Amino acid sequence: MNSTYKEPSSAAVPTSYAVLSLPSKATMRRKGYNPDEVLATHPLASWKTFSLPVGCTYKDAVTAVQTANAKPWGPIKIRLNFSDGRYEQFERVAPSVMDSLQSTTTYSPNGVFKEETLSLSTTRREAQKPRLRPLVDERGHHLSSKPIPRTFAPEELYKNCPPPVLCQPGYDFTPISYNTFLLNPQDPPHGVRSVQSNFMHSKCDYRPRSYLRPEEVTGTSHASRHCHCNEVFQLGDHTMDFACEGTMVDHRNRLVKKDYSPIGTLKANSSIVGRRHARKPRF
Amino acid sequence: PPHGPANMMSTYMTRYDYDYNRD
Amino acid sequence: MREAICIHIGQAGCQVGNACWELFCLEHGIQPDGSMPSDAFNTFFSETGAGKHVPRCLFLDLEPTVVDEVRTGTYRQLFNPEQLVSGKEDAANNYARGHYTIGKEIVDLALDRIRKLADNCTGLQGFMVFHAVGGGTGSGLGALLLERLSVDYGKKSKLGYTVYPSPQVSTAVVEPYNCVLSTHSLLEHTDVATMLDNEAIYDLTRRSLDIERPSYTNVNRLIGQVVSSLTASLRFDGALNVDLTEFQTNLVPYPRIHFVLTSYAPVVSAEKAYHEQLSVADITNSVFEPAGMLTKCDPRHGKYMSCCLMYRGDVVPKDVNAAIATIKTKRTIQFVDWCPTGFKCGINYQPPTVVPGGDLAKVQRAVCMIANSTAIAEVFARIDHKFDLMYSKRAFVHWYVGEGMEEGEFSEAREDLAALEKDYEEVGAESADDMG
Amino acid sequence: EKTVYNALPKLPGFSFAELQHPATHGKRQYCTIDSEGTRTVKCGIPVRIILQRFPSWRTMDDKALRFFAYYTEDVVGSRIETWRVRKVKLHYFLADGSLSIVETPAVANSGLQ
Amino acid sequence: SYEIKPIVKGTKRDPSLLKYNKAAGAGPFGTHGYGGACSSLRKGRPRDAPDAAFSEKGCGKSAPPKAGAFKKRVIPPTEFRRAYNRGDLPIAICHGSRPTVDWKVEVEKLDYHHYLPIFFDGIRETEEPYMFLARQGCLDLLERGGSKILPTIPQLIIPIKTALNTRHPDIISATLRILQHLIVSDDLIGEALVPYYRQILPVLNLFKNVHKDAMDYGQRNRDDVGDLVNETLQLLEQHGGDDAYINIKYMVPSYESCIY
Amino acid sequence: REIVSCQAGQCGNQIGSKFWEVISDEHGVDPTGTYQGDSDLQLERINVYFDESSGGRYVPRAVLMDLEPGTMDSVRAGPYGQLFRPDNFIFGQSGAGNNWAKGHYTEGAELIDSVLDVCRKEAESCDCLQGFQLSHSLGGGTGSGMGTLLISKLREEYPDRIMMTFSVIPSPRVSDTVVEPYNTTLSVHQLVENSDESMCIDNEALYDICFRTLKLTTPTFGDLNHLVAAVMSGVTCCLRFPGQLNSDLRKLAVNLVPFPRLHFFMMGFAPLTSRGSQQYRGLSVAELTQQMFDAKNMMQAADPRHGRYLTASALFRGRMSTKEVDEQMLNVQNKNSSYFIEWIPNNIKSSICDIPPKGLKMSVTFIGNNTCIQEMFRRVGEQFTGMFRRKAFLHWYTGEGMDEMEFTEAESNMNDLVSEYQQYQDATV
Ligand SMILES: Nc1nc2c(ncn2[C@@H]2O[C@H](COP(=O)(O)OP(=O)(O)OP(=O)(O)O)[C@@H](O)[C@H]2O)c(=O)[nH]1
Ligand SMILES: Nc1nc2c(ncn2[C@@H]2O[C@H](COP(=O)(O)OP(=O)(O)O)[C@@H](O)[C@H]2O)c(=O)[nH]1
Ligand SMILES: [Mg+2]
């Protein structure tokens, strides 16, 4: 090469360079090979490989390649190995002349892999990119000016769980809560086996009674108003109905209603019937 | 180091022991 | 190596230190004379050329009663004449006086002693501080010491097992003032703050330990049990070993959000114990009980940021995983949508050593939890309402201002901890695209 | 050494951890750094009874036992003696378990040092 | 915009003089990677760091730092310059066809024990007129002293070695010329200087083989430091004693006897 | 052909400890370092994992890494801890705190030079290095970050060698670290980039194995890590012992990696029998194949039914003949052609080695480049998005020094990896 020098767009630093060195003329004669008759490599060609200095640039790598080729007869083939697995070829057009040094191809081990990659990976990358856009500041502060719902409001904290009604008995001080045995719907992660550390409580055994509960003809699954005692709860200005999980669970206690936002995130399930407009009593 | 005569009741016998290292 | 220097500031800190150091001595086989009649002690006890073991502790107090009680107590030969810093006059339950008037005349020599322990500690992991922010010295001098330690030792771990004012019955009336100001001072200058209010300890002792008359001794015994459970990972061999800084990242999601809850299990008495087979699943369930938490805050009243479970004894990782799976199967407790993992686990082989005369029946296995949850903001909101009711009327402002404190510092504390409130709100908020 | 509990070779399910309990779960500090790099990994009578039997004693420092002995050597190129006896004093410090020998002559014109 | 820094090496504005003569300078007035395609065609980066020395790979391309034997040291402050600035030197330059030194008094009757060491100390100067005054005064005192130079031989050793140790080629050449003039001043000068070979000859050893079909058309200045060193060695042997050769051989190993 | 091993973090350190005790048992090496075996074959290739000293001890070619010296102390307190060389113990002052940033950039970087020094000393001590082994966890701080840094700086120092990683991947339902997705992404985009073959362990698959296959009542980390030790012994059994059809580590790599980015494998061991059911087993080649390809026996939490086998390898040990192994490996492919990708025939390599594990008539280790690795990658990436949208726990990394662009490109690389697993799973001829 004289002035064909191009700077690669990639930032992979050169790593080493291999010379397919070819033995001397007398060596070829005493092996029985004619040096004048030289896609398959010559039988006597041997891959003698040399290394590049730490943090060498492309100019240094090409200078080292030229220094390796400086031998009048030995080198015929040079492979400049970069840091990304690629190798730039530096073949000799004519093995018996010095000046005919030229690059031919730059093969990469990931060549065809990326060639068939950049049809589906780009689509998935484009889909995933807007999900990675940060939704908050460095601290918890969300960027947008749109107000978030009251997070500690009961109608936001207890959308799908019965509220923790507090009882003084059992305590001599402020009540805290009592844990509930209630289970989540069976939502196994996709693509994993039924791997269990120990005998577990099967979720199908504890399917809610409000599943295919007959709605009678009233249009309400509930019968008596003990639904207010056990199923239906009031959350400030909102009314919660816990029987709404019957439409979300499968006959095997599997969550079938998985509402995904258009971006791809999951919208948390809710079981609020509506806003009970409680007001001061008036005459 | 040489191998001894092929012993069939040992988890450390080779296929080549079973074949020809009989002696 | 692996030293954890203990600091006990104020009366609550000093008594908790007495209890936990008794526990550590009985766990490591160290008598009050300091001689082992047999090197896991090296984390808490520094060796001497005469073979005795001096605790790596500093009992700092502004009034001499508790330190004099220590000097006349059982462990007088154990404890150094230094590392036992005594003031001449009390802080008078005033954060301003503990931080601005008497704090300077004692913090210089307190830091000198801290350096005299730190240079000895060749593998120091962090500082475990014990104080009550509700008092005067434990609040003011505690905050001053935390600031000085942060500016001196840099990014060293700082676990403040701090006792916070109770929701409904308080020792004092200026206690909300001291709490708000102390929290203002520590939000930046402490690493991990641990809730240690007395209501939940009293409630657990009365309900599970069958103690009709709980007291500070039982409270400090439970606190020492929890401290030993958290610190035994680097003291004894275990299946999963975790250091002081290991749960730092696993438990603090945001720099302001470091206040965390505690719960111990099994908190069981001798009579209760032989009726119960304390399996890993059972002890984990008792941990995740809202009642079992050592704080008068309901974890069911909010989301869970991240939980850390320190198992001790003959626990097996198989049963630990089974317990984690069966506790996530529960709907009554729910995590934030942005922490699907939300769990850290560390298993230590050493079972908890029972203290003679103690109320805890020893068990083959016991698990503690240190957990960050959004529901911890209840105590902050309540203490803020208290501080607001008093500060609107300007009650007890003259004491603090005459104690060398700016009048605007109350306002700054209120604003910044209100920012903490809203931070808790909006980190408990779910992830919706409208936020972006 | 070789017993029933050690008979089983190491197979995925043939190892019993609870059989081999370490005596102490305390984790001995083999590995230590000396704060300047340098990574490193690593008198017969008991003092209790010797102090119990001597109530007035507090420490064994500077409390050696004074003994008197002699060592004899053959002298071949002398003029008057053929077998010489040299006298020594023994100091046996009990605190250190240490022995010291000091040469002490008898007559003024000993010729020894 | 930017700034221009012209090359000033070997020019009129060369700062080498300033940075080698600290006391002087003033006037007369004070990314991807192969993750599954490992092959025998690549190696690791060579370890050419100095710490790699005496290891499995060896030094590689890590040369040791130079000892700075040829490095040009800073000239020590000179009592001759201090005394001239004070006003104690009875010398002044006279300008004409060739610059010369004019004396207050006859050189013959001056106290050489005072004046000769000062002039010999002044040879290290790199700024005129101090250099010219010192060297011309040395030459005048040597050629007009007679037998008064012999007792001052012990006192002249410190200035000579101090000037030689500077590693300045010009200073070394000037000291060599002055040493030749001193040797050819009396019969016993070389005899007295034989014991002092161990403090003068090391610099001559260092600069013995330093020179700077084509002739050197300019050599009247006699700037060849190696040639001057050789000439001084031959002159020392000629006007020395029996032990002169053995002392010179002990100092410089590559020297050859000019009388045996 | 020498193997030099490194173990980082506590996870990797106890796993490597058990691996070394297993190798010592196989070669008849007692804890004191001498040889008390019962055959000459244990000396033929004892140099692969051990070096004889001037005390007669067979010191392992093992390098231990931990910012926490506590695990170093635990292993030296272990039964076989005296085997390791004292100077190979590299440790620091403060632990990583489960922080990839601390393990990779500040605390690990200060000790990476010393660990490179000792590893290089072991390298030139070895006659011909066949390659490097690594054991660590992707969810830890100094196991993941420091291990990835080690492999990155050894790619640029021994690129022609084979560097394996038996990394222990995390799991959401086995969550025992809340920054597992961060550490896993940061370590996967380095392993896919610098690990020539990186085969993974999920502790829940091991729990399943010890639950219904082994049926152990109380299996601690000892019995837990014994499976990983067994598979590590199996992948180099053909190296350490003669075989009817032997192979080596780079044989496995070249026959299991079709494209440079597709090198994340699953593992499997056989036979494994519950305590009290040996009388029902047959212990034959067919049974070994069945337990090999059984879904529950796989020691990585993935469902091969939902994926396709790019390439599998079966390393048999014991006195068996080649016809039945070939017939079984053909029959499984023929009967499960829906689970073997059609654009490559006979996806299963079979290697036969003389020596079965001590006490076992015959055994086999399984390596599988199934496309079902994509579900674990997708799960970890989904958790990573879940935390990254709110940038939870990101302040630790950002204040420790790394920037957000590295995190974003890390997940970009991992998403490309899972996308290409899907692409080749769905590829047609
Ligand atoms: N857990 C626990 N808390 C205690 C104990 N003793 C005192 N406290 C707490 O301390 C508060 C009372 O104030 P002080 O103990 O005097 O706090 P102080 O700042 O250390 O001392 P002062 O400045 O004099 O108030 C109470 O609200 C308790 O919560 C104890 O033994 N255990
Ligand atoms: N199989 C096995 N896994 C372990 C062991 N110790 C830790 N782990 C796993 O390693 C992960 C955490 O790694 P960690 O301890 O933080 O790594 P480190 O910080 O670098 O020491 C957990 O998910 C555990 O499942 C062990 O002894 N055996
Ligand atoms: Mg007090």
Burial of F426 (0-12, 13-18, 19+ CB in 10 A): exposed
Resolution to one decimal, Å: 2.9
Contact F97 C342 (CB under 8 A): no
Name the active-site residue from C22, C27, C63, C246: C246
Burial of E101 (0-12, 13-18, 19+ CB in 10 A): buried
Residue type, E139: L
Is residue C172 helix, strand or coil? coil
Q: How does DSSP assign C319-375, residue by residue?
A: HHHHHHHHHHSBSSS-B-TT-SS-EEEEEESPPPPPPTT-SSPP-SEEEEEEEEEGG
Contact E36 A18 (CB under 8 A): no
- Residues F307, F309, F313: CA angle, nearest 5 degrees: 145
Among F159, F193, F260, whose Cβ lies nearest the Cβ of E43? F159
Among F91, F218, F223, whose Cβ lies nearest the Cβ of D39? F91
Other C-beta atoms closer than 10 Å to the C-beta of C264 total 25
Handedness of CA C173, C175, C180, C184 (dihedral sign): positive
Alpha-helical regions (H) of A118-245: 121-132, 154-157, 227-230
Best residue for ligand 2 mutational test, from F6, F7, F11 (most atoms within 8 Å of Cβ): F11
Ligand 3 mean position, distance from CA C172 (Å): 12
Dist. CA A255–CA A249, nearest whole Å: 4
Dist. CA E63–CA F151, nearest whole Å: 30
Dist. CA F109–CA F145, nearest whole Å: 10
Is residue A92 helix, strand or coil? strand
Dist. CA F423–CA F416, nearest whole Å: 10
Residue of F nearest to C429 (CA): F390
Pairing of strands C45-47, C53-55: antiparallel
Residue type, C183: T
Residue C200, CA atoms < 13 Å, CB-side half-sphere: 28
Q: Six-digit token pair at C229?
A: 């459970």
Q: Look at the block and give the residue holding tokens 């059982």.
A: C74
Which of F270-283 are b and which e, b meaning 16 or more Cβ less than 10 Å from the residue's Cβ? bbbbbeeeeeeeee
Other C-beta atoms closer than 10 Å to the C-beta of C184 total 20
- Residues F207, F209, F212: CA angle, nearest 5 degrees: 105
Contact E38 F159 (CB under 8 A): yes
Q: Look at the block and give the residue holding tokens 């490095």.
A: E71
> Which protein residue's CA is at the shortest distance from atom 26 of ligand 1?
C171
Alpha-helical regions (H) of C33-91: 64-71
Task: Please report the residues numbered 235 through 264 in chain F whose beta carbons come closer than 8 angstroms to any beta carbon of chain E.
Answer: 250, 253, 257, 259-263
Tell me which chain A residues have a C-beta less than 8 angstroms from the C-beta of F415.
121, 124-125, 128
Is residue D90 helix, strand or coil? strand
Give chain E's largest Cα–Cα span: 94
Residue F229 Cα to chain centre, angstroms: 9
Dist. CA F198–CA D79, nearest whole Å: 90
Dist. CA D25–CA F73, nearest whole Å: 12
Residue type, A58: Y
Contact, C140 vs C100, CB < 8 A?
A: yes
Contact D27 C235 (CB under 8 A): yes
Handedness of CA C71, C76, C78, C82 (dihedral sign): positive
Dist. CA E120–CA E107, nearest whole Å: 15
Tell me which chain C residues have a C-beta less than 8 angstroms from the C-beta of A253.
none
Is residue F24 helix, strand or coil? helix
Helix (H), strand (E) at residue F164:
strand F162-165
User: φ, ψ for residue C365 (rounded to 5)?
Assistant: -155, 135
Helix (H), strand (E) at residue C19:
helix C10-28
Contact, C185 vs C143, CB < 8 A?
A: yes
Contact, C429 vs C336, CB < 8 A?
A: no
Ligand 1 mean position, distance from CA D94 (Å): 53
Task: Please report the residues numbered 209 through 268 in chain C whose beta carbons come closer than 8 angstroms to any beta carbon of chain A.
Answer: 254-257
Dist. CA A88–CA A102, nearest whole Å: 10
> How far apart are the two ends of chain C, measured CA to CA in Å?
47
- For residue C278, what are the contacts with CB-CB under 8 A and spacing of at least 6? C266, C268, C363, C364, C365, C366
Dist. CA C420–CA C428, nearest whole Å: 12
> How far apart are the two ends of chain B, measured CA to CA in Å?
15
Pairing of strands F309-318, F348-353: parallel
User: φ, ψ for residue D28 (rounded to 5)?
Assistant: -70, 135
User: φ, ψ for residue D69 (rounded to 5)?
Assistant: -145, -175
Q: Six-digit token pair at E92?
A: 């002044």
Dist. CA E94–CA E99, nearest whole Å: 6
* Interruption sites in chain F after residues (C→N beyond 2.5 Å): none
Q: Six-digit token pair at C25?
A: 């001595």
Residue F119, CA atoms < 13 Å, CB-side half-sphere: 28
Residue of E nearest to F195 (CA): E35
Contact A183 C330 (CB under 8 A): yes
In 3D, which of C69, C100, C101, C63 has the Cα closest to residue C85?
C63
Dist. CA C312–CA C351, nearest whole Å: 5
Contact, F146 vs F96, CB < 8 A?
A: yes
Residue A22 Cα to chain centre, angstroms: 48
Q: Six-digit token pair at F76?
A: 């030296």
Dist. CA F230–CA F360, nearest whole Å: 12
Residues by chain with Cβ below 5 Å of ion ligand 3: C 11, 63
Burial of F156 (0-12, 13-18, 19+ CB in 10 A): middle
In 3D, which of F167, F114, F128 has the Cα closest to residue F145?
F167
Inter-CA distances, F41 with A74, C51, F53, F103, F247, Å: 46, 51, 20, 41, 17
Q: Which ligand 1 atom sits closest to the C-alpha of C196?
A: 1
Helix and strand counts by DSSP (H, E) for chain C: 15, 11
Question: F215 - beta bridge partners?
Answer: none
Tell me which chain E residues have a C-beta less than 8 angstroms from the C-beta of A83.
31, 33
Tell me which chain C residues have a C-beta less than 8 angstroms from the C-beta of A157.
301-303
Chains F and E touch (3+ CB pairs under 8 A): yes
Q: Six-digit token pair at C258?
A: 């470091």
Dist. CA A181–CA E56, nearest whole Å: 66
Which of A238-247 are b and which e, b meaning 16 or more Cβ less than 10 Å from the residue's Cβ? bbbbbbbbbe
Contact, E134 vs E89, CB < 8 A?
A: no
Q: How does DSSP assign A229-252, residue by residue?
A: HHTEEEETTEEEEGGGGGTTB-TT
Alpha-helical regions (H) of chain E: 16-20, 79-86, 112-121, 130-145, 157-164, 169-183, 189-193, 197-206, 225-238, 242-251
- For residue E51, what are the contacts with CB-CB under 8 A and spacing of at least 6? none
Q: Six-digit token pair at C155?
A: 């990014």
- For residue C167, whether the previous peptide bond is cis, meaning omega lies within 30 degrees of 0, is no
Ligand 2 mean position, distance from CA F143 (Å): 8
User: φ, ψ for residue C424 (rounded to 5)?
Assistant: -60, -45
Residue type, F84: F
Pairing of strands E91-94, E100-103: antiparallel
Q: Look at the block and give the residue holding tokens 């050789």.
A: E230
Dist. CA C237–CA C228, nearest whole Å: 14
In 3D, which of C261, C298, C273 has the Cα closest to residue C208?
C273
Which of E104-117 are b and which e, b meaning 16 or more Cβ less than 10 Å from the residue's Cβ? eeebeebebeebbb
In 3D, which of C125, C163, C121 has the Cα closest to residue C142?
C163
F205-F206-F212-F218 Cα dihedral, nearest 10 degrees: -140
- Residues C278, C284, C290: CA angle, nearest 5 degrees: 115
Is residue F244 helix, strand or coil? coil
Q: Six-digit token pair at A138?
A: 């460095």
Is residue E134 helix, strand or coil? helix
Contact, F420 vs A117, CB < 8 A?
A: yes
Q: Six-digit token pair at D38?
A: 């340098």
Q: Six-digit token pair at D99?
A: 């022995």
Dist. CA A207–CA D95, nearest whole Å: 79
Dist. CA F309–CA F329, nearest whole Å: 13
Is the shortest distance between the CB of F137 and ligand 2 below 6 Å? yes
Contact, F275 vs F265, CB < 8 A?
A: no
Contact, A246 vs A211, CB < 8 A?
A: yes
Dist. CA E224–CA E208, nearest whole Å: 10
Among C1, C41, C234, whose Cβ lies nearest the Cβ of D32? C1
Q: Which ligand 2 atom sits closest to the C-alpha of C239?
A: 27
Which of F304-319 are b and which e, b meaning 16 or more Cβ less than 10 Å from the residue's Cβ? bebbbbbbbbbbbbbb
Inter-CA distances, F158 with E35, E257, F121, F161, F194, Å: 13, 60, 13, 6, 11
Best residue for ligand 2 mutational test, from C237, C240, C343 (most atoms within 8 Å of Cβ): C240
Helix (H), strand (E) at residue C127:
strand C126-132
- For residue E129, whether the previous peptide bond is cis, meaning omega lies within 30 degrees of 0, is yes
* Interruption sites in chain D after residues (C→N beyond 2.5 Å): 42
Dist. CA C303–CA C430, nearest whole Å: 10
Burial of C190 (0-12, 13-18, 19+ CB in 10 A): buried
C246 is catalytic: yes
Chain D contact present for F273, CB below 8 A: yes
Among F25, F114, F223, whose Cβ lies nearest the Cβ of D17? F223
Q: Six-digit token pair at C204?
A: 């657990």
Is residue F152 helix, strand or coil? helix
Chain E contact present for F160, CB below 8 A: yes
Handedness of CA F38, F40, F45, F51 (dihedral sign): positive
- For residue F309, what are the contacts with CB-CB under 8 A and spacing of at least 6? F339, F340, F341, F347, F348, F368, F369, F370, F371
Contact, A54 vs E48, CB < 8 A?
A: yes
Which of F185-212 are b and which e, b meaning 16 or more Cβ less than 10 Å from the residue's Cβ? bbbbbbbbbbbbbbbbbbbbbbbbbbbe
Dist. CA A71–CA A45, nearest whole Å: 14
Dist. CA A251–CA A230, nearest whole Å: 22
Inter-CA distances, F25 with D25, F267, F358, Å: 25, 22, 8
What does chain D come to in residues? 113
Contact, F265 vs F29, CB < 8 A?
A: no
If you compute the radius of gyration of chain E from its CA atoms, what whole number of angstroms results? 25
Burial of C88 (0-12, 13-18, 19+ CB in 10 A): exposed
Q: Six-digit token pair at A178?
A: 């009592």
Dist. CA E117–CA E110, nearest whole Å: 13
Dist. CA A43–CA C288, nearest whole Å: 74
Dist. CA D90–CA D85, nearest whole Å: 16
- For residue C222, what are the contacts with CB-CB under 8 A and spacing of at least 6? C201, C204, C205, C264, C267, C294, C360
Inter-CA distances, A95 with A25, A37, A73, F177, F321, Å: 12, 10, 7, 61, 52
- For residue C303, what are the contacts with CB-CB under 8 A and spacing of at least 6? A157, C334, C335, C336, C373, C374, C375, C428
Among A119, A136, A198, whose Cβ lies nearest the Cβ of F211? A198
Q: Six-digit token pair at D32?
A: 């230590």
Give chain A's largest Cα–Cα span: 122
Best residue for ligand 2 mutational test, from F10, F100, F146, F175 (most atoms within 8 Å of Cβ): F10
Pairing of strands A87-89, A78-82: antiparallel
Q: How does DSSP assign C239-267, residue by residue?
A: SS---TTHHHHHH-SSSS--EEEEEEE--
Question: C264 - beta bridge partners?
Answer: C368
Contact D31 F72 (CB under 8 A): yes
Other C-beta atoms closer than 10 Å to the C-beta of E8 total 11
Is residue C107 helix, strand or coil? helix
Is the shortest distance between the CB of F209 and ligand 2 below 6 Å? no
Question: C262 - beta bridge partners?
Answer: C370
Contact F392 C251 (CB under 8 A): no
